[model samples]
Target: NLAPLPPHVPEHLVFDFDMYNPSNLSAGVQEAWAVLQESNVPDLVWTRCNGGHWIATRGQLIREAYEDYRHFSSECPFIPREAGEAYDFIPTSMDPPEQRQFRALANQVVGMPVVDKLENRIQELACSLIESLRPQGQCNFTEDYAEPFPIRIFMLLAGLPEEDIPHLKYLTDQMTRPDGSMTFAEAKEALYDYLIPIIEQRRQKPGTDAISIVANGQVNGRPITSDEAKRMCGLLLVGGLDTVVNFLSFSMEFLAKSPEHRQELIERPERIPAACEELLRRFSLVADGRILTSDYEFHGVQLKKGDQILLPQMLSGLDERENACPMHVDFSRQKVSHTTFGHGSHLCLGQHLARREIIVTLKEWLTRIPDFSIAPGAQIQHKSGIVSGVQALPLVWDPATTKAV
Candidate 1:
């Protein structure tokens, strides 16, 4: 179930922005968006970014569009005409009847049972990664830990090698966060080129890994095509690589800088999971607005067919109308709801892996490095769009408190 958009949105403050240059934050996207919320932006808006699109500012409207896929078409999920046109990435691209098959295949790899199988590995990875960094008493959080942790786990699940990560990760980053060097077409092409050989190799001779499972798996009683495998595999990569990578950094950085919040979790380990919920609510990640397939009125505004409808997937609990003290982080707060991993049929498939990594990291790391903070006056910078992350997070701590879990 979802809430309908509010009747009538002001025309001046549309949710749209140049996602590429999205924030007013001199530093990055998340901060830029923070500035907007502070300025009291509207719940929805029309923007010229990606050749023009609508954006849903609040969580409720975004949730509604995700639930009602019919109105907000997933066929053209990506912004900018090229990416959206080329964005037929399996279950995410298909809706309803056709969406179910690939989605089921995806479920096989990241579902609860598979997650249980990888539980120990996930724990070991987080512990090992954190222990290695603790002695240094300082580290680059993003590159050193965040990116590799989840990507390595997904690679293990998919039965791919870690060495291959450097190449694919570069491409994925370009798609989500363009460096201005590559056009949207170039990014998509590079992604396809990289996937083609691996997919072809798997097609010729499959194995027991996730790649094999998805490649050889049936969709509508037929083996999934090479192209389909490529795109779907790509989605899994982004899901595991982008979302959790950024999330780990954000939550860790927050906990590092805010002792009061950190102490609450440290004193009550049971509260760690709930704290994850609240963090997601307060620091909602980058959002992608959907496009409307039919002419209709939404929230008192006239929406015409083919009009780009921006329904952000990330829940920004910033609006007080949705949550009390939307900016504060209260670990014990009840009903700490958020669509951080998204909703509906296109909900994040690798979410199980993500939560396990987060929960395990929070419980394990804090037990050891319980008292660390961002280096003196070190400003945490953020980058936004389809994926958002910290540019660098420098920290200092005493080795005395650090020990292996």
Candidate 2:
């Protein structure tokens, strides 16, 4: 699983990969990671941005690090130790044994049971959102449909008010791509503060809502703590807020430009599931990595006991080495696999919900306005830091193609 390292050890050529920094191009997220796959570069490079770390540029190395969580600890998984220290979102930041406890609790809310129960509701929301946009031939895909649809669904699942989405999503966005209003730690703490009172309220009187379920539920035979519940809840908020919103923008942007890809999906609707997998692999929106727990050698690179390693979740399967034309949207590809959700135990727990949201969007959007794309001459912008995303997606469609829901 290891590859040969550069000729020099601990070279000073580390690129400070500022994931939160905005990209000037429309190909925002994937294009940033595509650098790792580009030819004539070292297999691994050191990055000092966000407090210095190593970037694994291939699927094989990224997968190995994700699977072998022992050497690469997820405890302080993020860079800029300040941000990592402030990020205590349970299960994700905690490794196994401790990690297992809260993960089970999270599953209760976003897992299959909740998804099945909300299946009809999710479909209805998708249709309603799409229908609302049909009358308007032009729309800001991010605001009109992408953001509200998933955020509202998450609010329903989390027992929060849809009205609060504007505020909640703002806080979560600061954690990944800051608007310069706050640092990742500050924004995350604000979210935690908001959750504290809610956790206390839910603890006193549990309900059918997902938050109440986790707040009042037991993990490993013990009642989950308010602290643990808050952390898990916060992670859910971020997962729901950031992951899907950005993913929808990324997916739709691609679909907008690639008419052939859209036609394939329109013709072969059943391929939607596999198409979802392929898109996830292609987009890989999340930005995450690991730190070395002890001195170790990986891919011919020798590391001291405390040096950190960065394995962006976006890089794996993103490179052409693992996938032919890694960036191309080949919906019919027989085997579409990637660690886009994540690898090994820390893989995205709400991945089922992610897939569901995506499939529903693809099916419904096509029904309303089959043709969409980057607005006429409007450029696509990207940001990289913790989680990669699009700034704006201006989409215009033909009024004739619009259908009544």
Candidate 3:
């Protein structure tokens, strides 16, 4: 059931690997993708799975490609050509000088200064959410905590209705992991349609919320256009709603399975920050690609113009070449290296906020429920696409074992 290979693609280089649905997926999304880094697989191989694209298997190649954006343009960052071509997420879609303008504005909104200002809210929300679920003793970590916690905080910041999450989240999910129900264009259009009125309203009567700020804000010393605001705001929605939301579940799922890891954090709460970094490395998710701007030979492989290559940010952390015993989660590990956020000028803008949320979650959740584990007899499932995620994480603990903090 493979799509026809392009004439220029070499036969030996074809792996027929589907990033959306990998053969080793049943093992775990990260493990499933590690297949690409296996010794048997070349550093760079062409996959006929999703319309015949190159996959940079090693961290070295992944980093090099991201750094050399001149040849690998961000004009089309997603795979399956249609989605990448349809991608128009402001700074993410723009490269270099042009990308800098929007990136600056985006940083002003979600950077460290903003995260510092919101620290109190981030702390309070983590406590409230954990306290509410503590007494329940059994909870779907994904929906109960993972989805609501970060999302609620983001909605508060973005000035979006909590009720709008279901609709908006679904649309964002479609762009990353489509179910074939809607094309990328259709999904993106639906998002824009939802944002159009809001953009107009905000422009007329702006507020301090993220959307209004972008709507009425300046880029390159001029007020941003309505269409530009919509595009930038759309990317913000995706980042706020999707990025940390999924990473949290993956981190928590690991905590539930590794009691020792939880105890280490609980005993020395100060180490929570370090633990967060380790978790981010271990459970790193999010993989995106760039479309070739011209034919270029990279690492001995010939890539044609218009070729697409998926340089997984997740792969770098898992690669033993980048870190020792990469799979093993060692909080005390002297040097933790990975491009979980991203690489080069396009590094994730919301990273400051994301780190804050992850750190808060670790400190607060462990403070209350020091002990917990995956629900009995339930198999954890994962879905892979632009950002891989756990489908559900049912965590359980006895009420007597849990204490109110």
Candidate 4:
């Protein structure tokens, strides 16, 4: 689905790369995306794919655009134009100043303090999930572990029903990786349908759950409206059910294939936290972008008002200019840089929760099942969109080597 180029865009700047399904995707999601950083491609190019958008291939431009949202607005943050046009999730949908206020209320739920409070639950859940899978010898890591561990924990934290996870997960998934089951708008509206009653109840009588905290909360000293509350809650649901769920699979697939890296962490478990950072960098998966707010000159190219720019967060840390040996995962690197969580005013509030979950999984999974690998003859395929994800990760190991715990 290519879009017609505007008169302002030069043909030289055009490089049609699809954000939803990059042409070189079979190579590996990150590897395929890294193609943009190659010597020949300009630092910023206009891709005709996904309804014609500008792409920032380098970290410097991406950071600048993220920081300067005035030129690059988040009002339409997703790509394929129409999906972003419909995306009204609070904090993200709105820019700073106004965004900063609601962000505080969101921070109340998925922020660091919430992680500190839920530490035991996070720890216990990781251990329990790993223990159940260990005795099985082989498992589909994505389905068996990745989905349940964090999603279940998030369900508990959000005070949402376990049964609804399937439906909720379906709705959020479509917004990023559409399976043709529904349009992004339909999926988004369905999500709002799920959150409305929940927010309505929490408004009258609140609970400690993230939904209640966000719905019953306020922005700029004014009580949050039902529409605003639903928008914020919808964003929270997508973050909870989507981001970490896909990330854990990528991290595990890498660890399963790289025993030396796994051993380093197993021998020095304290290194897990740092390794988590490095892993986050190497496997950074999100690829959402912003719409150009007005006619502007960027990187010597002329961008007109209403042109969308694909500033992939995944591409930032992977840029060679940003990190030496960008593809290699080096946990000990003095500086690990990336926007895996997000960047600028809309820096993901769920990050603290994400890190806790990643760190706990690495430590607990390694301790119990030290020896594991991709199932022999199994090919791991990844799907790409607003968020990139592993279709399935089949991992196998010897049951005896796994501890009872």
Q: Specify the highest-lDDT model's number.
A: 4
C-alpha RMSD for every candidate? 4.6, 3.7, 1.6, 1.4
Over 4 Å off, model 1 = 1-17, 23-42, 314-316
Question: Which residues of candidate 4, in runs, are more than 4 Å off?
Answer: none
TM-score of each prediction: 0.89, 0.92, 0.96, 0.96
Q: What digit string (tens of lDDT, one per residue) describes model 1 on residues 190-261? A: 877877787788888887778877778788777889878877877777777777787888887777878888
lDDT tens per residue, model 3, 117-226: 78899999888888888777799888888788888888888888899989988987787777788888999899989888988988778887878778776776788898
RMSD of 1: 4.6
Using alpha carbons, what is the TM-score of model 2?
0.92
Model 2 residue 332 CA deviation (Å) reads 1.4
120-164 per-residue lDDT for model 2 (tens digits): 888998988788788688888899888988888788887888777
RMSD of 4: 1.4
Candidate 4's residue-wise lDDT over 173-235, tens digit each?
A: 888787888888899888887788888888778987877887777677788898898888777
Cα error of candidate 3 at position 231, Å? 1.1
Stretches of model 3 off by over 4 angstroms after superposition: none
- TM-score ranking from best candidate downward: 4, 3, 2, 1
Worst 10 residues of 1 by lDDT: 1-10
- How well does candidate 1 match the true structure in TM-score terms? 0.89
